[PDB]
Amino acid sequence: KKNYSYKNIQAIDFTNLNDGEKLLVLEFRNHPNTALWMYSTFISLKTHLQFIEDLKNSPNHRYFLFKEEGVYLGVGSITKINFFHKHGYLGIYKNPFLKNGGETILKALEFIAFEEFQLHSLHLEVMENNFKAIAFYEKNHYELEGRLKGFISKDKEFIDVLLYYKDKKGYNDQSLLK
Amino acid sequence: KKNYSYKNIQAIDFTNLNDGEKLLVLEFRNHPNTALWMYSTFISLKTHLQFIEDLKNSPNHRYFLFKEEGVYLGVGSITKINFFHKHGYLGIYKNPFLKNGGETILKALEFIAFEEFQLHSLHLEVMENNFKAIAFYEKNHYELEGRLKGFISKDKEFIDVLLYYKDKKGYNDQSLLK
Ligand SMILES: CC(=O)SCCNC(=O)CCNC(=O)[C@H](O)C(C)(C)COP(=O)(O)OP(=O)(O)OC[C@H]1O[C@@H](n2cnc3c(N)ncnc32)[C@H](O)[C@@H]1OP(=O)(O)O
Ligand SMILES: CC(=O)SCCNC(=O)CCNC(=O)[C@H](O)C(C)(C)COP(=O)(O)OP(=O)(O)OC[C@H]1O[C@@H](n2cnc3c(N)ncnc32)[C@H](O)[C@@H]1OP(=O)(O)O
Numbered sequence: 001k002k003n004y005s006y007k008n009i010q011a012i013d014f015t016n017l018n019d020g021e022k023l024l025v026l027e028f029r030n031h032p033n034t035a036l037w038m039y040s041t042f043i044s045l046k047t048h049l050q051f052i053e054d055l056k057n058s059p060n061h062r063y064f065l066f067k068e069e070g071v072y073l074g075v076g077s078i079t080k081i082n083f084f085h086k087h088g089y090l091g092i093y094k095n096p097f098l099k100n101g102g103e104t105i106l107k108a109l110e111f112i113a114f115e116e117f118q119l120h121s122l123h124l125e126v127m128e129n130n131f132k133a134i135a136f137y138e139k140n141h142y143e144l145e146g147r148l149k150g151f152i153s154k155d156k157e158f159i160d161v162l163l164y165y166k167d168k169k170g171y172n173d174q175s176l177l178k
Numbered sequence: 179k180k181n182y183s184y185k186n187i188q189a190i191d192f193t194n195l196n197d198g199e200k201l202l203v204l205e206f207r208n209h210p211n212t213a214l215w216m217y218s219t220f221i222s223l224k225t226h227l228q229f230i231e232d233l234k235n236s237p238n239h240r241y242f243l244f245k246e247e248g249v250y251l252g253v254g255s256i257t258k259i260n261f262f263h264k265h266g267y268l269g270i271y272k273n274p275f276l277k278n279g280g281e282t283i284l285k286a287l288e289f290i291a292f293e294e295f296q297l298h299s300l301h302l303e304v305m306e307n308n309f310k311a312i313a314f315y316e317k318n319h320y321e322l323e324g325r326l327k328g329f330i331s332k333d334k335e336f337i338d339v340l341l342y343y344k345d346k347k348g349y350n351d352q353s354l355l356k
Binding site (some may be wrong): 040082084085145146147148149150151152153 | 217262299301341
């Protein structure tokens with residue numbers, strides 16, 4: 001339950017958020033630009049505060065608020081971590097008031113996952129209609145590995161979740177080639 | 179947190195297990211024939227008892243001990259349930275001292291998932307080297323939808339998890355054709 005540093009980027013564990021930061025995360029999370037692409041649309045403050053409390057005893061779920069030179073970039077998570085099998089799932093939503101930031105969050109987040117946690121593989125669940133996220137991860141060398149068919153209810157139809165992954169060798173190859 | 183009935187089969191929620199049944203489940207679970215195919219190999223009694231306690235406040239995770247005319251058939255679960263999106267994951271291990279039983283557990287379990295819970299889809303994670311389980315689900319009309327690549331550590335190598343699913347229409351088609 002500690003923070004991390006990558007370049008001039010800080011990853012603030014959710015369990016170390018000051019009270020302003022707790023509300024900022026909630027604002028980021030409930031914004032239409034974020035919520036539309038989440039499994040649940042709206043998080044009450046009560047739910048949010050409880051979630052953060054529960055994270056204190058949930059070492060397999062790590063949420064970070066990313067900050068860089070005074071700017072809050074957005075949120076990244078590494079979840080359903082398993083340390084024997086060395087896998088985890090990645091999640092990101094950027095500050096909805098900023099034009100970019102996702103790339104920076106991803107780089108720091110992958111540093112944490114592959115170097116600090118020494119994970120072997122990272123997996124992604126992304127809604128099949130989330131074209132901006134799909135393109136984003138494909139550009140970052142994430143590779144398609146399947147679907148969860150009809151996993152999501154959207155506008156009264158069931159649509160798919162897409163599954164992507166990156167392993168440690170892939171991560172290494174990116175870094176060897178600067 | 180209630181039990182269910184399907185034909186002459188009882189599904190006993192883990193939160194309603196008598197103390198003998200709690201130890202029987204643990205015996206089923208830690209047996210080499212079960213454990214070899216689980217994400218974790220060995221569950222201590224302490225962990226087990228805590229797990230059952232936590233299930234009392236975990237409506238999205240349902241574990242059942244199946245019994246039929248005095249015979250304990252094994253365990254089935256419907257987990258990571260989401261009631262807006264109407265999905266869940268299925269899991270089974272039979273009484274390792276019996277030659278069959280999986281089929282019976284599956285039928286009752288699918289009844290619970292699709293009729294009682296009214297889920298739209300059920301998903302499976304199965305280790306790629308688990309040939310007996312693979313054949314079993316394929317025979318029961320589960321359909322391949324992808325992989326979690328290198329998800330599992332086995333004998334110091336990383337192997338894959340296979341993803342399968344069945345939806346409500348598939349379930350219906352089976353039942354229409356008796
Ligand atoms: C596995 C999962 O995490 S699934 C859930 C994914 N999360 C979400 O969908 C939440 C909503 N979306 C986001 O948080 C983000 O858009 C992410 C994390 C998906 C991607 O991060 P982004 O910063 O948006 O990366 P992206 O490549 O799409 O940025 C757009 C680029 O074009 C510009 N741009 C900004 N907005 C847009 C836009 N709507 N359309 C096209 N270009 C845009 C930007 O300037 C940026 O380029 P630059 O940094 O060089 O200046
Ligand atoms: C998504 C998930 O749940 S993944 C984890 C799956 N669970 C496990 O791997 C735990 C260990 N294995 C099991 O629990 C079970 O074997 C299951 C649930 C996978 C399948 O249930 P089973 O009862 O074994 O079904 P299966 O079709 O393989 O039964 C074997 C059949 O051939 C006979 N048979 C019994 N043992 C064997 C055996 N080792 N090999 C071949 N045939 C056998 C049986 O008589 C049975 O037929 P019958 O009921 O008509 O008499």
